[PDB]
Amino acid sequence: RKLCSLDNGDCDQFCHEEQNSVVCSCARGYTLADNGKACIPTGPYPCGKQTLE
Amino acid sequence: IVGGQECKDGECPWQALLINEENEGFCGGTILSEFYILTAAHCLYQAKRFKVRVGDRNTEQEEGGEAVHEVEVVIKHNRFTKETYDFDIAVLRLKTPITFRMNVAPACLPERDWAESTLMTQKTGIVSGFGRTHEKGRQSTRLKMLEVPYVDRNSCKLSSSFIITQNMFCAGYDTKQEDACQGDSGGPHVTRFKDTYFVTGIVSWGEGCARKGKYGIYTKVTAFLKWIDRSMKT
Ligand SMILES: CC(C)N1CCC(NS(=O)(=O)CCNC(=O)c2ccc(Cl)s2)CC1
Ligand SMILES: [Ca+2]
């Protein structure tokens, strides 16, 4: 397929085709990385992560 | 949970347990944030008054990480119906904030469209809880988890003696003896995506437990995302 249908558009989390091309976004507690794809936890115990410590 | 494995240290941190006057867990819940818990609306009738315990994995000990929380506000969906278990969803607002830590963390809320096309199209999801390990057995003392395959909606409906509304979905196996069970209700059904777990459902109901030709029925969380956000804003 194409765009978001193609490996989630290379996004870590949310993917949506805006005006063609791809646009990635993140859940609450995360901030989109510089590459506009990865999602960086904005603090300890971000949502959806199993806890190690 | 029938079958499946028990949640090891830190594997099911978003799991919440509702306890009665007797400190007995009757239902599960999912941590959405420091103040909110997601659960089944039908669970709100299985106890006249209850509290919320998080960070617990063995209900007959004290790992020291357990924490009891009192419910400040109970936000039930005004369209829930005991007759069909439709709109089986509710949000709990806690009096005091949850302190995230080992075994105590929230699951992420996805966006409707992305969730439906990417999370729910995945092979499996994961349900967990302190419910029975056998249809007739007693509540489990150790928290368990089970990987349950998403079930084709068609099969789902054809296999159900009860109406499967659009606020529901099937997960589980046709004949394999693994499924959620009584007590896991209101609990978490989360789907994994790149190591991040998203809330995709609420343990709702089933005809018995792990019965052949039957599946586990969950509340389709994606159908209540707006409602959930509204509930949390206030
Ligand atoms: C109103 C209709 C839809 N009934 C709801 C309760 C159902 N009984 S039950 O679910 O309480 C039996 C025990 N099983 C469970 O609680 C669950 C099994 C699988 C999941 Cl998912 S919940 C029977 C059908
Ligand atoms: Ca304990």
Side-chain angles (χ1 to χ4, degrees):
Chain A
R1 291 177 171 175
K2 273 187 53 184
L3 291 171
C4 287
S5 289
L6 177 59
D7 197 57
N8 199 51
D10 202 43
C11 301
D12 257 20
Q13 297 176 4
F14 312 144
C15 190
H16 64 285
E17 297 159 41
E18 246 183 58
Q19 195 174 307
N20 198 255
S21 76
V22 161
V23 184
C24 305
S25 62
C26 311
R28 267 159 285 141
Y30 291 81
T31 53
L32 192 56
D34 247 48
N35 56 11
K37 304 189 181 179
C39 291
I40 314 298
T42 310
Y45 305 112
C47 71
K49 291 295 181 181
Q50 297 175 299
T51 61
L52 302 59
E53 50 172 53
Chain B
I1 301 293
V2 179
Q5 305 293 166
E6 79 176 13
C7 292
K8 295 311 179 181
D9 212 29
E11 296 193 311
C12 314
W14 36 78
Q15 174 76 54
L17 183 64
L18 311 184
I19 56 184
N20 55 33
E21 315 295 290
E22 181 177 51
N23 286 303
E24 183 72 57
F26 56 100
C27 276
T30 306
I31 299 170
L32 298 183
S33 65
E34 63 185 346
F35 275 123
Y36 295 101
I37 296 301
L38 173 68
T39 188
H42 79 258
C43 281
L44 302 179
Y45 305 28
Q46 307 195 303
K48 50 179 179 292
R49 200 271 283 185
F50 61 93
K51 287 177 178 181
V52 176
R53 183 192 303 165
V54 301
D56 184 19
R57 292 193 302 126
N58 174 37
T59 62
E60 61 187 2
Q61 193 173 298
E62 289 298 305
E63 171 161 45
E66 301 72 52
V68 174
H69 283 270
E70 300 192 306
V71 183
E72 161 167 294
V73 189
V74 179
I75 304 179
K76 186 188 64 182
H77 195 302
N78 57 45
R79 293 182 61 176
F80 167 64
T81 169
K82 311 205 299 180
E83 296 88 64
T84 58
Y85 260 47
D86 188 35
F87 295 94
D88 194 21
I89 180 173
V91 164
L92 312 178
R93 161 98 182 175
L94 308 179
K95 301 184 194 181
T96 61
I98 294 173
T99 299
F100 302 152
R101 53 190 187 282
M102 181 75 124
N103 292 298
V104 185
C108 301
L109 283 161
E111 302 185 323
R112 179 181 92 275
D113 299 337
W114 179 74
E116 302 189 338
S117 73
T118 311
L119 294 182
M120 305 198 81
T121 47
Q122 300 284 293
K123 299 275 75 176
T124 73
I126 293 163
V127 58
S128 63
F130 288 100
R132 308 182 182 186
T133 56
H134 308 296
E135 188 183 315
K136 292 180 175 181
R138 80 180 63 184
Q139 293 267 171
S140 181
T141 52
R142 294 309 184 90
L143 170 59
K144 297 180 64 192
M145 58 156 280
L146 170 64
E147 191 161 301
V148 294
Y150 275 102
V151 169
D152 158 69
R153 198 169 192 72
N154 193 197
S155 309
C156 184
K157 297 180 177 176
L158 290 175
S159 73
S160 181
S161 302
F162 294 96
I163 189 64
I164 300 299
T165 73
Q166 289 194 175
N167 302 312
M168 308 173 194
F169 77 84
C170 282
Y173 309 89
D174 168 45
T175 52
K176 196 181 175 186
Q177 283 281 304
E178 293 196 296
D179 185 22
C181 195
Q182 189 70 191
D184 300 311
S185 308
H189 172 289
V190 291
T191 300
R192 179 187 194 171
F193 191 74
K194 301 187 178 310
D195 286 321
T196 302
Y197 296 75
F198 293 92
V199 186
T200 42
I202 307 171
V203 185
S204 192
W205 60 273
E207 299 185 61
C209 295
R211 290 183 181 172
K212 295 183 179 68
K214 297 304 179 177
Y215 298 105
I217 311 300
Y218 302 71
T219 302
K220 190 171 183 182
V221 163
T222 57
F224 301 107
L225 291 175
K226 302 294 181 180
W227 185 90
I228 290 175
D229 287 310
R230 277 176 268 158
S231 300
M232 291 171 75
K233 257 62 169 62
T234 39

